[PDB]
């Protein structure tokens, strides 16, 4: 129930309306990533780099297995059954992730029966038939590079240089990998890890993983760029150096009787000065309730806002009174920079601050003037069929509000200062004045 007519005079021109939708109902698939390549067809002079690489990988991967083994040891069937005394400290999300891990262990056990076949894979991407209808997907790191560069040139170069090149490739892979799977991975028991982060074990190529799994949907890009596709590590093998990851594919469901409204800020004039209004630019209206939205964590689209979680945020009563037509409770800030917007377009109607920018009507050839008692001017074709704003000429529509828009004034809010350091200064000044009144009262 926003009052757009009053909000427009303080330079809050309404924008487009968007829908609100959140992910739900995920489907699951399992993939296998092998973190060590196969060097059989070039093994004659690989040197001792592979033993050192295995030594590094074992130390990298041991803490993950150690953390996974906590929930695996203490989960049984009493239908998922847990022992709270042994776990000790946990959160709700971690408990749910442990339940999901227990459920995924059933398929992990079947996948683990093909360990010999997994060890012998010699291609970047392979598919193994576990059954007539079931397939296992295996992805190997640095296999393509070896097969395409090192094997072909094994005879044209002394393989001391080949050993050096293999060592550099392995070290670069480890350097890229450490940013995600290192000590930063404090809690592997969770499903908030995105597929893009996991794909760093495959050189950052999540497109290959997604197209090999065969996920094809209209909202694929929207789900991908909103961090809605996530994965979970369910098994770590310290002998063959491979991991099993379950991937979740949710769908987007639209919340009914909910939408997000945008406001375009425009500077306005008051007492020979230029001001802007300090109000939220995105408002989440759900049923009839007005609240804030953490729009920075979501994905904005032409006609929708996609989030992986509900980001509703409470709103003060004074701001709610502001948004419903009480313009005297809306704070404003002074403008000292030369780079701020001075006009905007809404439904073919032009809202401009014709004091800071020259306005002219092409049909009559005479300028458009703004009085000192007005904040903005509403320009439509009832007074100017086409207007010139500097280097642009635009034809205008008709306003659907009050006929007397340019003759009705409104009340104005109090000035503010939103700088971080100014916030600390304003608190001190108020507190000192508060103590002065306290002593004078006493």
């Amino acid at each position: 129930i926003l009052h757009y007519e009053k909000l427009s005079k303080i330079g809050l021109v309404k924008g487009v309306t968007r829908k609100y939708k959140i992910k739900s109902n995920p489907l699951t698939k399992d993939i296998v990533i092998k973190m060590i390549p196969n060097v059989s067809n070039m093994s004659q002079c690989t040197g001792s780099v592979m033993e050192n690489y295995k030594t590094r990988l074992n130390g990298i991967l041991t803490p993950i297995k150690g953390a996974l083994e906590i929930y695996k040891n203490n989960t049984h069937d009493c239908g998922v059954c847990m022992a709270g005394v042994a776990i000790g400290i946990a959160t709700a999300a971690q408990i749910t992730a442990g339940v999901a891990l227990y459920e995924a262990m059933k398929n992990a056990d079947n996948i683990n029966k093909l360990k010999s076949s997994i060890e012998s894979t010699n291609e970047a991407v392979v598919k193994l038939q576990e059954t007539a209808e079931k397939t296992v997907y295996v992805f190997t790191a640095l296999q393509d590079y070896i097969n395409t560069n090192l094997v072909p040139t094994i005879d044209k170069i002394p393989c001391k240089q080949t050993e050096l090149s293999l060592d550099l490739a392995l070290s670069k892979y480890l350097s890229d990998l450490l940013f995600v799977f290192g000590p930063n991975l404090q809690d592997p028991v969770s499903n908030s890890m995105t597929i893009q982060a996991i794909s760093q074990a495959f050189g950052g190529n999540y497109e290959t993983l997604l197209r090999t799994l065969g996920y094809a949907t209209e909202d694929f890009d929207d789900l991908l760029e909103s961090d809605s596709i996530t994965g979970q590590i369910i098994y770590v093998d310290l002998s063959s150096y491979y991991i099993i990851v379950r991937v979740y594919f949710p769908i987007l469901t639209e919340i009914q009787q909910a939408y997000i409204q945008e406001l375009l800020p425009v500077s306005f004039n008051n007492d020979n000065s230029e001001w802007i209004s300090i109000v939220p630019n995105f408002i989440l209206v759900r049923n009839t309730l007005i609240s804030n939205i953490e729009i920075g964590f979501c994905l904005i689209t032409k006609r929708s806002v996609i989030c992986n979680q509900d980001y509703a945020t409470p709103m003060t009563n004074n701001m709610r009174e502001c948004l419903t037509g009480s313009t005297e409770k809306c704070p404003r800030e002074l403008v000292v920079s030369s780079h701020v917007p001075r006009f905007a377009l809404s439904n073919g109607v032009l809202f401009a601050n014709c004091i800071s920018v020259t306005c002219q009507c092409q049909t009559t050839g005479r300028a458009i003037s703004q009085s000192g008692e007005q904040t903005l001017l509403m320009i439509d074709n009832t007074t100017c069929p086409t207007a010139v704003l500097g280097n642009v000429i635009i034809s205008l529509g008709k306003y659907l509000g009050s006929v007397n828009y340019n003759s009705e004034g409104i009340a104005i809010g109090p000035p503010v200062f939103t700088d971080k350091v100014d916030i600390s200064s304003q608190i001190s000044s108020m507190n000192q004045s508060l103590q002065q009144s306290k002593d004078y009262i006493k």
Partner: antibody, heavy 118, light 112 residues
Framework: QVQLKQSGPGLVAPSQSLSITCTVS????????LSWVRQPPGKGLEWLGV???????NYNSALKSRLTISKDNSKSQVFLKMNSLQSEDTARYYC????????????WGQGTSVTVSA | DVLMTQSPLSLPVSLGDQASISCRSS???????????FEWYLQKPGQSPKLLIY???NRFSGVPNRFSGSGSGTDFTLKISRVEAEDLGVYYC?????????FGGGTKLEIK
């Protein structure tokens, strides 16, 4: 190298049971699936069934559920067991290994001739 | 089930000519994972069948370049550029996508 050996009784009286053993060498049953194929004397090849790595088996639907296939990883042997043999079942039986990827039967055994008669 | 039709039944061809064998399926044999498991086998008399083309267009190790496989959808063809004496035998098209797996009718190569 890899090679396949079959063994069997050869002559089977009608309405009795048939047992054929295929012994693998050069590769392990934990990394290959095995299929059974038979050929009538004047007909083309026919598919009987396959046993996967995990022990799941699939059979030809037309064989009237008279087939069962089992394997022994420790002895590296796979056994073909058939009951209610009749005159129509006289054929040359092969055991072939199916690759986990590319799904091809790349290795074949020498075959065992089975005759059902009085 | 998937019925496999192979024609011609017999292909009388003189030495050095081109041979083309076509095998057709009653329905699409694309597996749920995207692959198409289709193979060609050659059986010499008194010998076990051997693998020539282990996918639609993938040639097995040790197979001469004279053999080339191609096809899509429900039509698959095998082309022999230069017919030789050792190529005489029976050719089978085998599908391995949907249970039960089925063999082709078999094409008998014959010297004209």
């Amino acid at each position: 190298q890899v090679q396949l050996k079959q063994s069997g009784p050869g002559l089977v009286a009608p309405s009795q049971s048939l047992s054929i053993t295929c012994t693998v060498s050069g590769f392990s049953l934990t990394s290959y699936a095995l299929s059974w194929v038979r050929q009538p004397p004047g007909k083309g090849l026919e598919w009987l069934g396959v046993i996967w790595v995990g022990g799941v088996t699939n059979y030809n639907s037309a064989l009237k559920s008279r087939l069962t296939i089992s394997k022994d990883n420790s002895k590296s042997q796979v056994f073909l067991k058939m009951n209610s043999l009749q005159s129509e079942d006289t054929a040359r039986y092969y055991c072939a290994s199916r690759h986990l990827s590319t799904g091809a039967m790349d290795y074949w055994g020498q075959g065992t001739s089975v005759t059902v008669s009085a | 089930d998937v019925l496999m039709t192979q024609s011609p039944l017999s292909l009388p061809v003189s030495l050095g000519d081109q041979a083309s064998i076509s095998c057709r399926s009653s329905q699409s044999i694309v597996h749920s994972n995207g692959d198409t498991y289709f193979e060609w086998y050659l059986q010499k008399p008194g010998q076990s069948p051997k693998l020539l083309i282990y996918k639609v267009s993938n040639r097995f190790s040790g197979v001469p370049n004279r053999f080339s496989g191609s096809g899509s959808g429900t039509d698959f063809t095998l082309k022999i550029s230069r017919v030789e004496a050792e190529d005489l035998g029976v050719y089978y098209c085998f599908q391995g996508s949907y249970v039960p797996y089925t063999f082709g009718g078999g094409t008998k190569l014959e010297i004209k």
